[PDB]
Amino acid sequence: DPDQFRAIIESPEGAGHVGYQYRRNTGSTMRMVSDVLDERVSLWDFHCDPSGNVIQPGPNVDSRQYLQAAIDYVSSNGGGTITIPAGYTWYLGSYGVGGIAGHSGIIQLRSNVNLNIEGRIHLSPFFDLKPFQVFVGFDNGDPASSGNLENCHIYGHGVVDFGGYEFGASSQLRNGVAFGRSYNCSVTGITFQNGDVTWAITLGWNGYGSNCYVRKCRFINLVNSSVNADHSTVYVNCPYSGVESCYFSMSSSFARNIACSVQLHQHDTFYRGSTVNGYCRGAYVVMHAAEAAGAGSYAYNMQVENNIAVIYGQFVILGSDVTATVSGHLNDVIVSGNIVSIGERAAFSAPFGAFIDIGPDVQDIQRVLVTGNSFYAPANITDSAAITLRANLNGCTFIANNFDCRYMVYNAPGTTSPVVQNLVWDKSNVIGGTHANQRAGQNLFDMQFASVVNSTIEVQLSCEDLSMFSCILFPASCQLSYSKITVDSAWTKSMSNTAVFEGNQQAGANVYVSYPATVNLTSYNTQGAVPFFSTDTNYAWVTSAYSLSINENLDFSPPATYTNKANGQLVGVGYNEIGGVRSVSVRLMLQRQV
Amino acid sequence: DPDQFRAIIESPEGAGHVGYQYRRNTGSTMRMVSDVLDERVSLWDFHCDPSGNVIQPGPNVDSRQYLQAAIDYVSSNGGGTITIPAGYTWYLGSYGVGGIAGHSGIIQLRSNVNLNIEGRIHLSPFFDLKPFQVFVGFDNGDPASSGNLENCHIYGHGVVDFGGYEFGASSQLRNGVAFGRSYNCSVTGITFQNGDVTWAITLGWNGYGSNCYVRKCRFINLVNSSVNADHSTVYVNCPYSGVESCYFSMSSSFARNIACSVQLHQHDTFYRGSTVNGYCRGAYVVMHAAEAAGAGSYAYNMQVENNIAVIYGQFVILGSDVTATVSGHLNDVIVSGNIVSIGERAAFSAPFGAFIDIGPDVQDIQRVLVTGNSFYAPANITDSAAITLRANLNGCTFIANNFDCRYMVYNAPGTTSPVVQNLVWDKSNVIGGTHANQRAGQNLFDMQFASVVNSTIEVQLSCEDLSMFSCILFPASCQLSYSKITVDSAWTKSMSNTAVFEGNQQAGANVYVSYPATVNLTSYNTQGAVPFFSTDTNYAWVTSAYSLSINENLDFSPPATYTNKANGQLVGVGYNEIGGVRSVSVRLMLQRQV
Amino acid sequence: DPDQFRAIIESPEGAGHVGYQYRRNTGSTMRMVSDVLDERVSLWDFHCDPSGNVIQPGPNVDSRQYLQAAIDYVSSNGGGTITIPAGYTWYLGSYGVGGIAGHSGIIQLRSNVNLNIEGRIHLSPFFDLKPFQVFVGFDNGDPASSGNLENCHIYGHGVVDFGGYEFGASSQLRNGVAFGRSYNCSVTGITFQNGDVTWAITLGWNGYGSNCYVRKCRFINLVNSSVNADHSTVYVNCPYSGVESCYFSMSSSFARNIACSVQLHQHDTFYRGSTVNGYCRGAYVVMHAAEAAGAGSYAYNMQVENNIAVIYGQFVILGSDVTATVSGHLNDVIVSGNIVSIGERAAFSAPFGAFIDIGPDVQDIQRVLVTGNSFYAPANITDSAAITLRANLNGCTFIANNFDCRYMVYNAPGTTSPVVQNLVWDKSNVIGGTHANQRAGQNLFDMQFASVVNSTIEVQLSCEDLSMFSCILFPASCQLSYSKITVDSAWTKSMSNTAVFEGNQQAGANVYVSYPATVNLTSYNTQGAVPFFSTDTNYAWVTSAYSLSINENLDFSPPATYTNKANGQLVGVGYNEIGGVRSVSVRLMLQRQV
Ligand SMILES: CC(=O)N[C@@H]1[C@@H](O[C@H]2O[C@H](CO)[C@H](O[C@H]3O[C@H](CO[C@@H]4O[C@@H](C)[C@H](O)[C@@H](O)[C@H]4O)[C@@H](O)[C@H](O)[C@H]3O)[C@H](O[C@@H]3O[C@H](CO)[C@@H](O)[C@H](O)[C@H]3NC(C)=O)[C@H]2O)[C@H](O)[C@@H](CO[C@H]2O[C@H](CO)[C@@H](O)[C@H](O)[C@H]2O)O[C@@H]1O
Ligand SMILES: CC(=O)N[C@@H]1[C@@H](O[C@H]2O[C@H](CO)[C@H](O[C@H]3O[C@H](CO[C@@H]4O[C@@H](C)[C@H](O)[C@@H](O)[C@H]4O)[C@@H](O)[C@H](O)[C@H]3O)[C@H](O[C@@H]3O[C@H](CO)[C@@H](O)[C@H](O)[C@H]3NC(C)=O)[C@H]2O)[C@H](O)[C@@H](CO[C@H]2O[C@H](CO)[C@@H](O)[C@H](O)[C@H]2O)O[C@@H]1O
Ligand SMILES: CC(=O)N[C@@H]1[C@@H](O[C@H]2O[C@H](CO)[C@H](O[C@H]3O[C@H](CO[C@@H]4O[C@@H](C)[C@H](O)[C@@H](O)[C@H]4O)[C@@H](O)[C@H](O)[C@H]3O)[C@H](O[C@@H]3O[C@H](CO)[C@@H](O)[C@H](O)[C@H]3NC(C)=O)[C@H]2O)[C@H](O)[C@@H](CO[C@H]2O[C@H](CO)[C@@H](O)[C@H](O)[C@H]2O)O[C@@H]1O
Ligand code: NA
Ligand code: NA
Ligand code: NA
Ligand code: NA
Ligand code: NA
Ligand code: NA
Ligand code: NA
Ligand code: NA
Ligand code: NA
């Protein structure tokens, strides 16, 4: 049948008739060529017209149904990896159908079906002014009724290009990859670019999912208009999941005001080793009660480490909230090894610059460690703080950071009156000098709170700034109890005010406080050991004080150390070599219970 | 010969007769189809019966000999990568033969032969109740006589499933990958699951090997029975080797009592960026003298950083030991950036909770830096410590950590009496408040040692805990010399005991100590400058003291500062505006040589 | 035409006549075998003689033109990935031509053309004694006229072997991969070995380039002769670029004196997670004004974290410089989590050992944070320092490090006289004890500078070292102002000198200083409250002092605290129970404005 043989060979079954054995090894399987070819699969195997003839991709070709067919087919065989070939741009030109339609989905991902994107995937103008989620892992329009997406990995050296199209309306949503209720899924190596989107990738769905990761990806120019309501490049909404070694860049002015790189919203999540430029915000670390279904109502074991950022707003934002029925809690957080600066901008030209923000809208944030970070803002940016503490806080600890910005602790007066507990600012935090001389009328630690309890503020300057009103100021409206507040004397000799308690709160029974002050004293006339007393009676709270001044006199000396008396004078015993009433003005370290 | 031509084409040599040139490029090599196919290799090329017909894998098919044949064949050509295809589960049903038999080996790995596991590898019930090591890189039953395994990489999106089978006896061993005397080997991307094993991966053999790594792997439910004697998921037994970005999870109760994620046992080894849940222990960092053959008897440059863990026992365990002939030493260790909690459990229901443990069974551990970590244990877990110091220590330094647990330093009285040198607890360690009010009868730093030398403990509270017996207590049995022990006054005003030296050890010539105390004093009756003396004679050791109390009196003041006298009284000079014997009880900061 | 059919099949077009459809799927594209084969490409498709017959690689075969042809061809189709097959060594035996010739180039890389190196690439002896750059991404002999290289990735399990050939002359250059003006390029997984080269990889060109990375690579024995002038394994000369998780090893003696692992020379660059053995230096972090064209004249956001190193010289070297026209600035640097030791060597046998060096040859270095690192040098290495501060510094901050070496701060007297600003050494830096008893004639902090301003040095010992001359010494030639210098008393009771100011600089108006001293005092004879005065008149600068000694006497007590008098005596009020002139020698804490 040698006519039939030639016909068979040229037919689509022809490769199934040509035998093969690996490297002529007689111990190897006797196969057909088609068997070996069938070990791999690409978009070319599905990118064909109804008569089976291949179609070249391009801007007038909608590749969506072909990729979907490929995905569908490989899913039917228990999975595999589909290559999107290099050297070609594959345009997407229509919405998907079925369970992804509720999500404005283009492509449905399926379990165990990996995409090796080596070429480029580009959105056609069909999508201009419309919502879209390019890859969707949900299988139901209602995520609560969705099955899971498992073991789906997107990787390669290729690109997803969003076509530069602006949002049509603020209320729209746009996404690159929504993995859905996603278990062991990942994106590695891909560049996402040239868009106006809400997110590039989302992981999980309200706590459902596990072991999802974004690694070695680039995210470039993904906000481009004033219509875009909000952008967060990666939203991590399942536990045991994270972002590592990624690069995030924006150029748009709008991004400086609206864009965040990462959301960590479930327990055991991380954001590491990544570089951010041009964004408003670095990361939110948040437990929303509305997202607590899959993994509980606590966000714990949250890690933000070893990132590099230039931002215009706030680096890390901490928060939690409630619904009628569920209480969200954020605890057990570490922020460490990050090097962050506020980019060159005018004061008040973007959201208030901060390393840590305690974001408003019942919060419960505690057990946070912020350690071994650097923060810098240029000297003109009045709105820059180590922490903007703008809502209730139940604990945050700062150790061994270097903060070089306008404020250390700040909240705006007569906005919120946060209730503050367990704010620990260790003496090993180094306060930079870039804003020296810029602080007229300002308090370095401006404690504009309802109350402060169980808190520690150990102020240590590293250079002079005599422009500042005070190192630390508590308004009379702020209650202060069971706290330690100290101001180290270095670089403070010429300051009129070091610590200010406008409500005399430092007299509290369990307030432990020390700071420098200038005190005028007068002695009795007695020759010999002689008392010196303060002229003012403002010191009923002082347990001891000691001299920070030299004694220019030969004929007498004031006391080295002082106690107080019931009338609020200080008193100490000096020495009159010759008698006479003495009158001196001395710099003292005032101490209370320390 | 056109009959012969058709026959040739359908034969196993047929692809070797069909010509090919890349993309019709006339400058390309004129090849045959078989040449291009021979560029890749899969298990399908060896998974055949004796007549060459392919065999489908499945639970009634033992794939072992076929994979071994593939490995053997590729090794003969100088190496390559064998694909274990996606969409299939490949069952292993028998032991291997030869040099791996001594190791209970299933598959022998060979140098330069990589395995790309995209499908699933599952153990058949043949292995129920038996020992096994799935992949073995030794080529001799005696590892000391083994050749090396070099340049062998196992990677992909696939899975090794251990079939859920329990151990048959405690004395058995079970492993996933033993690389052997392994140089430039790695496992990346693989999920190891559903087992009862000793290890999932071991790297090296008693110091022999180099540049072995486990990256982006998952390890899930690898302990399931009470028979399992001990589990450590990755054992690193060669230098210049490590674990990074991995995920470790257990669900079994037995795992909470026996399972550790990593062993770092040779120099220049690391454990980074990984997430652990459900394990007893995080990592051992140990030099066993018995393992010192390949790389010397020092474990140095050991790094445990930026991990996330929920454990039930101890995070990092430090140790070393000796044989008759060889002395093991552990030095130059860093533990940093880790965020760790003891999981919800009853007190004493698992091994004692600790961030650092100094593990018993001559140790030599020194030059350890523990910095910028968080640790948390729930308030009910009495058995929780920043360090359980249960064997000899030659040095460990703690700086800028946040420890929130029951004890800071602990050892059980009348177990061991460790000899302690160079324990440094810097003031920048922040002590959390979760266990406040839980510490009746307990010492926060319970120094239950034979001796303490060249040590620093700078206690700083961040909130009150008046339940505790003391901040720090030394029993009379503990010698204390050439040390600094300080208790900051903040939050201590109402404590009866701050530091306790049951053997009066704070009087030592080179002991530098300060802590608060209440002292009753009486003055002479003299008007004017007047001495006040303590009623008790317990202060022969005090170099100075100063007031931590206000003076409620108008008519006199006690001294601000005090020295001592030979009889052990304190003495200072106050001021009697009017004469009369005065009697006061004051809170003082007692100081010795500081 | 069945003769023609058989002929066609055996021809190079034969595979283009054999039909295929994926897995017999009738919905799949009807293709030819050649179409599926054309989805991949290897060196075999170009490694052929002029008649198209394949050539086997080997030491007598020059593979260069064949690889270049492959690269060229794939570039023409918009890119792809070329495999360099496993199981073969591919020798390079000649220079390339054209635009790479100016760079001594062998292979020209092209945009979007990736190289998957699974086999070995070896240099033939043609290259002995000659310069070479194996892979070059420039397209012009003058880099300023070069186009860019974009989207080029080199990866796999293979090896580049430099053939062991020595340099022929010091003035020559040799490189593995020069990416050129390189945007989104990377090298992953490759081992570079057995050479005498200047660099293994360079990224960027004078600030031009972006998003270039070296990951999971090994670099082994890349210096082997005394001819080699200088070696730096990776030179990062574009922003948003870095090195992570790499391994660097040298065995040569010459490497201990000349070799550095990484250069970070542009903003937003990083060096993380890597292990170094046998090198002189870890990393330079430098802004050269001569390299400022592409990305500006500031190196900012520079990160060196979580590395492991054994080196013989300096870990991190900081610098900047100028040209006639351009000023380079280095700022916003973090160095954190690194564990580093000086390898076993004789004192002065290699460049001076240091954790941080401020390298000479107008510098501008500021806003540097050095935190949470360990450093160790063996006790014999006299030339070991936490910082060698050998050129001008505008700021560096040290917090919570553990430095165990001979010096903390050092500069050699009568070499440079650096101008120092904003040097911050926080009290949380722990000073190790390995060099105790080795410091005869040495100052632990040897402040051999022109001047020191706005600086903080808080010395805290952790053990005794009475061998040292002083803890800190300022020569009379060093101006000191607006600074804080403190020496904690612990472990200092027996020291003759703690802080030394050879120019009496501690008297400065804005110098804040405290340290211990022994002081002889004499009292008046008066019974009762009685003054004690120092016999020496060296204390005009002291604001207060207090006792660090016990009082062995019953009949009197010296003052607990002292002030001074205009003549430079100290004075305080003690108590004579019985009268008589008293004479005591006491250890005091001397304080000035603190
Ligand atoms: C851009 C971004 O992520 N911003 C963060 C805030 O997130 C919140 O606003 C977003 C605005 O885009 C999201 O809401 C929008 O999308 C919702 C979800 O889309 C639906 O469900 C999807 C699964 C389908 O595919 C879609 O087709 C659609 O059906 C939609 O319901 C909203 O109407 C719309 O506005 C974001 O919603 C979350 O999206 C993730 C990712 O897709 C998804 O997994 C979640 O299910 C979904 N959550 C919920 C509850 O629906 C929404 O959360 C974020 O709130 C803010 C955190 O900071 C604030 O709150 C802190 C705690 O009080 C406080 O401290 C802080 O100061 C506050 O600013 O951070 C970013 O702004
Ligand atoms: C599970 C685990 O790793 N536990 C750690 C302890 O390791 C020790 O016990 C293990 C129990 O499973 C291992 O011993 C077992 O296996 C030995 C080796 O198997 C043989 O050799 C292999 C190469 C072959 O393939 C096998 O067929 C067989 O011939 C076997 O000899 C023992 O009888 C058996 O109990 C573990 O042994 C090491 O295994 C690694 C990995 O396979 C291998 O590379 C080494 O060669 C082998 N070492 C030796 C010396 O044989 C064995 O080390 C670990 O000791 C402990 C550390 O903490 C303790 O010690 C500290 C220092 O004193 C102390 O501070 C601390 O408090 C102590 O708890 O940590 C885990 O428990
Ligand atoms: C080995 C190394 O990298 N050493 C570091 C120092 O770099 C400087 O010396 C190098 C010696 O090899 C390089 O100069 C050499 O190469 C130059 C460039 O080659 C040319 O241009 C290439 C693009 C072509 O392919 C070549 O064919 C050739 O045309 C050449 O011009 C020089 O003559 C030659 O000596 C190195 O030069 C840089 O090389 C990189 C990587 O290839 C390239 O991207 C740059 O363009 C090129 N730069 C310049 C300006 O040409 C050259 O920089 C390095 O200077 C030192 C830093 O520390 C010192 O300076 C600090 C600041 O003052 C100071 O604090 C510190 O104490 C100092 O030691 O670090 C290493 O030693
Ligand atoms: Na929807
Ligand atoms: Na905390
Ligand atoms: Na209030
Ligand atoms: Na054995
Ligand atoms: Na240490
Ligand atoms: Na004892
Ligand atoms: Na050149
Ligand atoms: Na700094
Ligand atoms: Na000078």
PDB file of C-alpha atoms in Angstrom, chain A residues 6 9-12 14-15 37-38 40-42 44-48 52 73 77 157 216 218 245 247 273 277 306 308-310 337 339 373 376 400-402 404 428 430 460 462-464 488-493 546-554 557-558 560-561 575 577, chain C residues 1 5 17-23 25 28-31 33 36 39 77 114 153 155 184 211 215 240 244 268 272 301 303 305-306 332-334 367 369 397 399 426 454-456 482-484 509-510 512 524 531 540-541 543-544 561-567 571 592-594:
ATOM      1  CA  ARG A   6       3.366   8.119   1.422  1.00  0.00           C
ATOM      2  CA  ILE A   9       3.592  10.100   6.166  1.00  0.00           C
ATOM      3  CA  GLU A  10       2.353  13.433   4.887  1.00  0.00           C
ATOM      4  CA  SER A  11      -0.788  13.191   6.989  1.00  0.00           C
ATOM      5  CA  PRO A  12      -1.076  14.512  10.564  1.00  0.00           C
ATOM      6  CA  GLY A  14       2.878  10.680   9.806  1.00  0.00           C
ATOM      7  CA  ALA A  15       5.119  11.263  12.772  1.00  0.00           C
ATOM      8  CA  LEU A  37       7.192  15.459  20.208  1.00  0.00           C
ATOM      9  CA  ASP A  38       4.175  14.918  22.433  1.00  0.00           C
ATOM     10  CA  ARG A  40       6.317  19.136  24.956  1.00  0.00           C
ATOM     11  CA  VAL A  41       3.550  21.464  23.991  1.00  0.00           C
ATOM     12  CA  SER A  42       3.342  25.053  22.833  1.00  0.00           C
ATOM     13  CA  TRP A  44       1.616  26.661  18.215  1.00  0.00           C
ATOM     14  CA  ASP A  45      -0.123  23.343  18.763  1.00  0.00           C
ATOM     15  CA  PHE A  46      -3.476  25.165  19.262  1.00  0.00           C
ATOM     16  CA  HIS A  47      -3.003  28.454  17.398  1.00  0.00           C
ATOM     17  CA  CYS A  48      -4.818  27.241  14.236  1.00  0.00           C
ATOM     18  CA  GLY A  52      -5.978  23.069  11.238  1.00  0.00           C
ATOM     19  CA  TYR A  73      -6.413  20.269  26.693  1.00  0.00           C
ATOM     20  CA  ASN A  77      -4.170  15.035  30.675  1.00  0.00           C
ATOM     21  CA  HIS A 157      11.847  35.581  30.461  1.00  0.00           C
ATOM     22  CA  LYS A 216      12.314  37.695  40.393  1.00  0.00           C
ATOM     23  CA  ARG A 218       9.581  43.133  37.327  1.00  0.00           C
ATOM     24  CA  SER A 245      13.689  39.546  44.903  1.00  0.00           C
ATOM     25  CA  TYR A 247      11.711  45.008  41.113  1.00  0.00           C
ATOM     26  CA  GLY A 273      14.877  41.525  48.960  1.00  0.00           C
ATOM     27  CA  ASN A 277      11.128  53.233  42.945  1.00  0.00           C
ATOM     28  CA  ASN A 306      16.041  43.677  53.311  1.00  0.00           C
ATOM     29  CA  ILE A 308      15.408  48.972  49.016  1.00  0.00           C
ATOM     30  CA  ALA A 309      12.925  51.786  48.314  1.00  0.00           C
ATOM     31  CA  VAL A 310      12.443  55.312  47.101  1.00  0.00           C
ATOM     32  CA  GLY A 337      17.203  45.561  57.204  1.00  0.00           C
ATOM     33  CA  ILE A 339      16.921  50.996  53.373  1.00  0.00           C
ATOM     34  CA  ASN A 373      16.466  49.870  59.148  1.00  0.00           C
ATOM     35  CA  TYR A 376      16.174  59.258  55.043  1.00  0.00           C
ATOM     36  CA  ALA A 400      18.784  50.023  66.446  1.00  0.00           C
ATOM     37  CA  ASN A 401      17.340  51.949  63.492  1.00  0.00           C
ATOM     38  CA  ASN A 402      18.843  55.100  61.881  1.00  0.00           C
ATOM     39  CA  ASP A 404      17.026  60.870  59.403  1.00  0.00           C
ATOM     40  CA  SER A 428      19.951  52.602  70.193  1.00  0.00           C
ATOM     41  CA  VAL A 430      20.110  56.977  65.967  1.00  0.00           C
ATOM     42  CA  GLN A 460      19.524  60.498  72.002  1.00  0.00           C
ATOM     43  CA  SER A 462      23.769  62.882  67.512  1.00  0.00           C
ATOM     44  CA  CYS A 463      24.191  66.595  66.603  1.00  0.00           C
ATOM     45  CA  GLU A 464      22.727  69.911  67.656  1.00  0.00           C
ATOM     46  CA  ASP A 488      20.226  62.358  76.928  1.00  0.00           C
ATOM     47  CA  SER A 489      22.178  65.558  77.590  1.00  0.00           C
ATOM     48  CA  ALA A 490      24.487  65.322  74.596  1.00  0.00           C
ATOM     49  CA  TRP A 491      24.081  68.225  72.198  1.00  0.00           C
ATOM     50  CA  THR A 492      21.345  69.729  74.468  1.00  0.00           C
ATOM     51  CA  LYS A 493      23.254  72.296  76.576  1.00  0.00           C
ATOM     52  CA  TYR A 546      22.923  66.692  89.251  1.00  0.00           C
ATOM     53  CA  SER A 547      25.165  69.354  87.772  1.00  0.00           C
ATOM     54  CA  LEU A 548      25.886  69.573  84.052  1.00  0.00           C
ATOM     55  CA  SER A 549      27.830  72.835  84.411  1.00  0.00           C
ATOM     56  CA  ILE A 550      31.303  73.759  85.511  1.00  0.00           C
ATOM     57  CA  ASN A 551      31.845  75.914  88.610  1.00  0.00           C
ATOM     58  CA  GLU A 552      33.721  79.084  87.576  1.00  0.00           C
ATOM     59  CA  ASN A 553      34.147  80.110  91.269  1.00  0.00           C
ATOM     60  CA  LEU A 554      37.021  79.685  93.671  1.00  0.00           C
ATOM     61  CA  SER A 557      30.931  75.530  95.005  1.00  0.00           C
ATOM     62  CA  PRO A 558      27.248  74.667  94.438  1.00  0.00           C
ATOM     63  CA  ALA A 560      26.958  68.444  92.781  1.00  0.00           C
ATOM     64  CA  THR A 561      23.560  66.765  93.461  1.00  0.00           C
ATOM     65  CA  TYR A 575      30.476  74.563 100.248  1.00  0.00           C
ATOM     66  CA  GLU A 577      35.024  78.550 101.577  1.00  0.00           C
TER      67      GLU A 577
ATOM     68  CA  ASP C   1       7.063  10.796  -7.926  1.00  0.00           C
ATOM     69  CA  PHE C   5       9.356  11.270  -2.199  1.00  0.00           C
ATOM     70  CA  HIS C  17       7.088  16.688   4.923  1.00  0.00           C
ATOM     71  CA  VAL C  18       6.214  14.384   7.850  1.00  0.00           C
ATOM     72  CA  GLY C  19       2.958  15.532   9.422  1.00  0.00           C
ATOM     73  CA  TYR C  20       2.237  15.837  13.146  1.00  0.00           C
ATOM     74  CA  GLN C  21      -0.659  16.710  15.335  1.00  0.00           C
ATOM     75  CA  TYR C  22      -0.239  17.012  19.081  1.00  0.00           C
ATOM     76  CA  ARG C  23      -1.269  13.865  20.876  1.00  0.00           C
ATOM     77  CA  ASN C  25      -5.793  15.861  18.997  1.00  0.00           C
ATOM     78  CA  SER C  28      -4.688  20.802  17.250  1.00  0.00           C
ATOM     79  CA  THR C  29      -2.666  22.424  14.525  1.00  0.00           C
ATOM     80  CA  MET C  30      -1.722  20.216  11.615  1.00  0.00           C
ATOM     81  CA  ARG C  31       2.035  20.753  11.577  1.00  0.00           C
ATOM     82  CA  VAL C  33       7.848  17.531  12.355  1.00  0.00           C
ATOM     83  CA  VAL C  36       8.104  21.241  16.278  1.00  0.00           C
ATOM     84  CA  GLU C  39      10.735  25.353  18.595  1.00  0.00           C
ATOM     85  CA  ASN C  77      14.156  35.967  14.446  1.00  0.00           C
ATOM     86  CA  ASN C 114      19.620  33.704  25.841  1.00  0.00           C
ATOM     87  CA  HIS C 153      20.118  35.741  30.100  1.00  0.00           C
ATOM     88  CA  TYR C 155      21.912  30.226  32.692  1.00  0.00           C
ATOM     89  CA  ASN C 184      17.462  43.183  31.916  1.00  0.00           C
ATOM     90  CA  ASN C 211      17.997  45.302  36.138  1.00  0.00           C
ATOM     91  CA  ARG C 215      22.437  34.775  41.004  1.00  0.00           C
ATOM     92  CA  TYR C 240      18.819  48.524  40.010  1.00  0.00           C
ATOM     93  CA  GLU C 244      22.661  37.353  45.298  1.00  0.00           C
ATOM     94  CA  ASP C 268      20.083  50.914  44.010  1.00  0.00           C
ATOM     95  CA  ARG C 272      23.319  39.606  49.424  1.00  0.00           C
ATOM     96  CA  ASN C 301      20.557  52.852  48.212  1.00  0.00           C
ATOM     97  CA  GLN C 303      23.028  47.274  50.285  1.00  0.00           C
ATOM     98  CA  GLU C 305      23.552  42.111  53.645  1.00  0.00           C
ATOM     99  CA  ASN C 306      23.532  38.607  55.022  1.00  0.00           C
ATOM    100  CA  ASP C 332      22.441  55.964  51.906  1.00  0.00           C
ATOM    101  CA  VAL C 333      24.272  52.704  52.440  1.00  0.00           C
ATOM    102  CA  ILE C 334      23.354  49.736  54.667  1.00  0.00           C
ATOM    103  CA  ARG C 367      24.450  58.366  55.729  1.00  0.00           C
ATOM    104  CA  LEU C 369      24.321  52.372  58.543  1.00  0.00           C
ATOM    105  CA  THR C 397      26.692  54.965  61.951  1.00  0.00           C
ATOM    106  CA  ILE C 399      24.670  50.089  65.882  1.00  0.00           C
ATOM    107  CA  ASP C 426      26.465  53.413  69.674  1.00  0.00           C
ATOM    108  CA  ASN C 454      29.433  65.696  65.564  1.00  0.00           C
ATOM    109  CA  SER C 455      30.664  62.279  66.560  1.00  0.00           C
ATOM    110  CA  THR C 456      29.661  59.777  69.208  1.00  0.00           C
ATOM    111  CA  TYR C 482      30.432  68.942  69.304  1.00  0.00           C
ATOM    112  CA  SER C 483      30.973  65.315  70.241  1.00  0.00           C
ATOM    113  CA  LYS C 484      30.114  62.748  72.881  1.00  0.00           C
ATOM    114  CA  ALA C 509      32.493  73.962  75.187  1.00  0.00           C
ATOM    115  CA  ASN C 510      30.413  71.382  73.284  1.00  0.00           C
ATOM    116  CA  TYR C 512      30.236  65.823  76.329  1.00  0.00           C
ATOM    117  CA  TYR C 524      39.943  69.861 106.001  1.00  0.00           C
ATOM    118  CA  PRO C 531      35.000  69.404 102.230  1.00  0.00           C
ATOM    119  CA  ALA C 540      38.560  72.610  85.442  1.00  0.00           C
ATOM    120  CA  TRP C 541      36.521  70.819  82.744  1.00  0.00           C
ATOM    121  CA  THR C 543      30.886  69.264  85.701  1.00  0.00           C
ATOM    122  CA  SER C 544      30.412  66.377  88.198  1.00  0.00           C
ATOM    123  CA  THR C 561      29.705  63.316  94.429  1.00  0.00           C
ATOM    124  CA  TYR C 562      31.932  66.200  93.460  1.00  0.00           C
ATOM    125  CA  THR C 563      31.875  69.417  91.485  1.00  0.00           C
ATOM    126  CA  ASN C 564      34.882  71.526  90.593  1.00  0.00           C
ATOM    127  CA  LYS C 565      36.402  74.972  91.401  1.00  0.00           C
ATOM    128  CA  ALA C 566      38.006  77.580  89.195  1.00  0.00           C
ATOM    129  CA  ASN C 567      41.528  76.434  89.953  1.00  0.00           C
ATOM    130  CA  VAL C 571      35.440  69.543  95.613  1.00  0.00           C
ATOM    131  CA  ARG C 592      31.429  66.728  81.636  1.00  0.00           C
ATOM    132  CA  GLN C 593      27.961  67.906  80.612  1.00  0.00           C
ATOM    133  CA  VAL C 594      26.509  64.406  80.915  1.00  0.00           C
TER     134      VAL C 594
END
